[PDB]
Design a protein around this nucleic acid. Structure first.
Ligand SMILES: [Mg+2]
Ligand SMILES: [Mg+2]
Ligand SMILES: [Mg+2]
Ligand SMILES: [Mg+2]
Ligand SMILES: [Mg+2]
Ligand SMILES: [Mg+2]
Ligand SMILES: [Mg+2]
Ligand SMILES: [Mg+2]
Ligand SMILES: [Mg+2]
Ligand SMILES: [Mg+2]
Ligand SMILES: [Mg+2]
Ligand SMILES: [Mg+2]
Ligand SMILES: [Mg+2]
Ligand SMILES: [Mg+2]
Ligand SMILES: [Mg+2]
Ligand SMILES: [Mg+2]
Ligand SMILES: [Mg+2]
Ligand SMILES: [Mg+2]
Ligand SMILES: [Mg+2]
Ligand SMILES: [Mg+2]
Ligand SMILES: [Mg+2]
Ligand SMILES: [Mg+2]
Ligand SMILES: [Mg+2]
Ligand SMILES: [Mg+2]
Ligand SMILES: [Mg+2]
Ligand SMILES: [Mg+2]
Ligand SMILES: [Mg+2]
Ligand SMILES: [Mg+2]
Ligand SMILES: [Mg+2]
Ligand SMILES: [Mg+2]
Ligand SMILES: [Mg+2]
Ligand SMILES: [Mg+2]
Ligand SMILES: [Mg+2]
Ligand SMILES: [Mg+2]
Ligand SMILES: [Mg+2]
Ligand SMILES: [Mg+2]
Ligand SMILES: [Mg+2]
Lengths: 60, 67, 144, 185
RNA sequence: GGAUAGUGGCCUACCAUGGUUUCAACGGGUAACGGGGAAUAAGGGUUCGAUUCCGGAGAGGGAGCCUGAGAAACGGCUACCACAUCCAAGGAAGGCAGCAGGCGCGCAAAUUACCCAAUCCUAAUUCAGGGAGGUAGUGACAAUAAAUAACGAUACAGGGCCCAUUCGGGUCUUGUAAUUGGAAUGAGUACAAUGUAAAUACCUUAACGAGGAACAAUUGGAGGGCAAGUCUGGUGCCAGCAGCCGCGGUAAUUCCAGCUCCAAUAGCGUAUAUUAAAGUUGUUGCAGUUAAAAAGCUCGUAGUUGAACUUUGGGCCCGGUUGGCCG
RNA sequence: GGACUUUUACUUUGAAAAAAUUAGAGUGUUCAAAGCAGGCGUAUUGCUCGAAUAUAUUAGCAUGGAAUAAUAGAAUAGGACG
């Protein structure tokens, strides 16, 4: 195959995606408290059983 | 606090059977300080190049100033 | 019994046959011929640092259709020339021929990776500053 | 030229990395007994697997064998002494059948909670580590301690460290430095 | 016979023609010091050991030798070869695979620091000396323990549940809450004592030291294998992804981001190797009609293998170790 | 002490046997990796448990066994006992 194809576009999309800066957000509990936060979220007060248990449903 | 102790039959008995750094910690021996370890070694090695007393070599090196 | 001598004193025949048939084992063959030392641009090592000659637009294989950004590298310990990939969109702006990159295996036991034809190596660092770091923003490329 | 300081690792790691059923049952243990790692569960399963292994290797021998009796009773008596093995099922065909929660049950994490004193598995965590409750006068800050079935009667708050009564402490005594400084002179 | 401390083709003289080998001699290779051991966990195996102990070999490469109980010594000498230094040009001097440190080489590895206090060693010796060794520095090699929060109050709301003719919220807490509440502790800092040869840290412990601006956890992934979105924006077979299968050519469940989510977590990715998965090296344990594989055929030496039969059967005695019904 | 003995393989037990490593006992390094400690008293002039056990496989040595599998013997009798 060809080897000397163009290089002008090196970085095209990364350099033209609009930068939407991150958003400041509540600090997450780093440690056992997170495993606890997973426990009560997953098993204690379970949110929905709409057929099955969705773990990241946006527009359901 | 769990430690270890010695009690000697006399104070003379201690100042000979005791480590010389413990008598420093107490006061029963003045810390006679000397030049650094790697200074004494260099002194020894410098000393090893002179066969004899040496001050006889100071006379012949006084002849150097003439020539 | 189909072949293998079941006799109680046939150990030599059984050892030697194994010895002989190990050679059909692809890995056993390379390990004893020292192929990594003989062949294989890297001297048998995990990485190898080299120097960039020219920047190549290797065109991907089918059914893909792209231009995969790569650099021809002349390994220091070897002088062997090797064309290696520069991953991660961008990153061909970091290399700048005559530079000193650190190559690494591509993770297919030789065997060029994907649609990239005949590229068995990828860049990990340039100018000693960690391609990944340059990509994000963590480090900056050195003076020259 | 020194005798090599020996070491060993205290945990194993599961082969299937994303077995969802296994992950479920793990979080439950971490959430019940207040752990922070899967390694805190991996460790116990590692310790438990070797214990079974000795038991397995011993059963294959003939009953009342010298090694089997000597080392078998030791294993039984040790597990009993820390309170993991029941008094009746005390002949090592049950130590083969031991499960993870039995070991988790003896951690100073849990006895400190089971016997009041924390009202929460996680309050137990923070109390233990923070120079609070002891065994004798011997303070202990390791949530995994294996309360040994007879040191169970000695899990009280520390002689230091309020909640056992020695002093308020810097955070509380600071308020006593603003109640007597703003109100008085 | 000579030589050695001594055996011996160790060497010499004389004589003889022997010595090894398909049960692989001889030769080649080794990215080869051997071993205790290391990694991988059904077993059988596979792979590795330069390197904490033991043995051997070496001191830039060869050879030679002095001293001596012991060296073919190298921090001893002599010579040559290769290095390489100083000079007044006449000459003289060096051997870090000791401890540090430097250059080179590379993917790849730390201080030109302190002490003989310990462990031991040497001497004429209780003392001196010891870069042996110990101390500290550098140090995410590997290994252990396991902080980044814990508990109330209250504001709607929900599920319990007694009643339900019908207002509902009442006291059992499930917790999501954009106001609150006093509690706790070392990370750090630091009198002091402790530690230490002297210091440093650790273990102790005055005075300080937590509310989101923090004392603010990361590293990968979120189509399948594979745990976690068919969300919004961007690009438009480009840029890039993608171990493997495959994504991207204008509504992208794979790219570039935001959001949210998963996994492991003071750790996590990648590369290379190796082991398991591999009964894809198969002794245990493979396959060979057609998928890879029975020599065209027969003889046949080495090798492996090889029918059945030769004191069986009956009798007496001694004393052991479990287990029973009993104590 | 004298006089002689067909050869072997296998299996049993045992001696000979470094430590660290491994497996493993005892012991609450605050836990644990470790370590080989330590535990008791009259804690004002000592009492005292330890520092196990196992594997150590080919060869060599020692011993019990005599199935399995080899070897040798008396045929031109140049046989066997006395
Ligand atoms: Mg000196
Ligand atoms: Mg072939
Ligand atoms: Mg080219
Ligand atoms: Mg001769
Ligand atoms: Mg001849
Ligand atoms: Mg052969
Ligand atoms: Mg070599
Ligand atoms: Mg080797
Ligand atoms: Mg294999
Ligand atoms: Mg070795
Ligand atoms: Mg080497
Ligand atoms: Mg030598
Ligand atoms: Mg050298
Ligand atoms: Mg020499
Ligand atoms: Mg030297
Ligand atoms: Mg020497
Ligand atoms: Mg050096
Ligand atoms: Mg390194
Ligand atoms: Mg030193
Ligand atoms: Mg932090
Ligand atoms: Mg804060
Ligand atoms: Mg992230
Ligand atoms: Mg995404
Ligand atoms: Mg899934
Ligand atoms: Mg394809
Ligand atoms: Mg659009
Ligand atoms: Mg769109
Ligand atoms: Mg989209
Ligand atoms: Mg991992
Ligand atoms: Mg078999
Ligand atoms: Mg097959
Ligand atoms: Mg065909
Ligand atoms: Mg065929
Ligand atoms: Mg045929
Ligand atoms: Mg033929
Ligand atoms: Mg037969
Ligand atoms: Mg034996």
């Amino acid at each position: 195959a060809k080897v000397h194809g163009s290089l002008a576009r090196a970085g095209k999309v990364k350099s033209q995606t609009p930068k939407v800066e991150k958003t400041e957000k509540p600090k997450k509990p780093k440690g056992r408290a997170y495993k606890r936060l997973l426990y009560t979220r997953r098993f204690v007060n379970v949110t929905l059983v709409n057929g099955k248990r969705r773990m990241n449903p946006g527009p359901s | 606090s769990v430690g270890f102790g010695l009690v000697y039959n006399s104070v003379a008995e201690a100042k000979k059977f005791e480590p010389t750094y413990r008598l420093v910690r107490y006061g029963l021996a003045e810390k006679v300080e000397k030049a650094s370890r790697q200074q004494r070694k260099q002194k020894k090695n410098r000393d090893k190049k002179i066969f004899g007393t040496g001050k006889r070599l100071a006379k012949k090196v006084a002849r150097r100033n003439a020539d | 019994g189909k072949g293998k001598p079941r006799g109680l004193n046939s150990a030599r025949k059984l050892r030697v046959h194994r010895r002989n048939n190990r050679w059909a084992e692809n890995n056993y063959k390379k390990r004893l011929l020292g192929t990594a030392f003989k062949s294989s641009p890297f001297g048998g090592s995990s990485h190898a640092k080299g120097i960039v000659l020219e920047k190549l637009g290797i065109e991907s294989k089918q059914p893909n259709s792209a231009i995969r950004k790569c650099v021809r590298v002349q390994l220091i310990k070897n002088g062997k020339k090797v064309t290696a990939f520069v991953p991660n969109d961008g990153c061909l702006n970091f290399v700048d021929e005559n530079d000193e990159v650190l190559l690494a295996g591509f993770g297919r036991k030789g065997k060029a990776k994907g649609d990239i034809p005949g590229v068995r190596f990828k860049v990990v660092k340039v100018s000693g500053v960690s391609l990944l770091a340059l990509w994000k923003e963590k480090k900056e490329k050195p003076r020259s | 030229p020194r005798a090599p300081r020996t070491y060993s690792k205290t945990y194993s790691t599961p082969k299937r990395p994303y077995e969802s059923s296994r992950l479920d049952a793990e979080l439950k243990l971490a959430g019940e007994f207040g752990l922070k790692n899967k390694k805190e569960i991996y460790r116990i399963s590692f310790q438990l697997s070797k214990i079974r292994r000795a038991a397995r290797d011993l059963l294959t021998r003939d009953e009342k064998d010298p090694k089997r009796l000597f080392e078998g009773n030791a294993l039984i008596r040790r597990l009993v002494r820390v309170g993991v093995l029941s008094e009746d099922k005390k002949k090592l065909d049950y130590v083969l059948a031991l499960k993870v929660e039995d070991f988790l049950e003896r951690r100073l994490q849990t006895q400190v909670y089971k016997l009041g004193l924390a009202k929460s598995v996680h309050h137990a965590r923070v109390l233990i580590t923070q120079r609070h409750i002891a065994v004798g006068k011997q303070i202990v800050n390791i949530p995994s301690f294996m309360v040994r079935l007879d040191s169970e009667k000695h899990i009280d708050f520390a002689p230091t460290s309020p909640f056992g009564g020695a002093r308020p402490g810097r955070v509380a005594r600071r308020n006593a430095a603003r109640k007597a400084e703003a109100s008085g002179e």
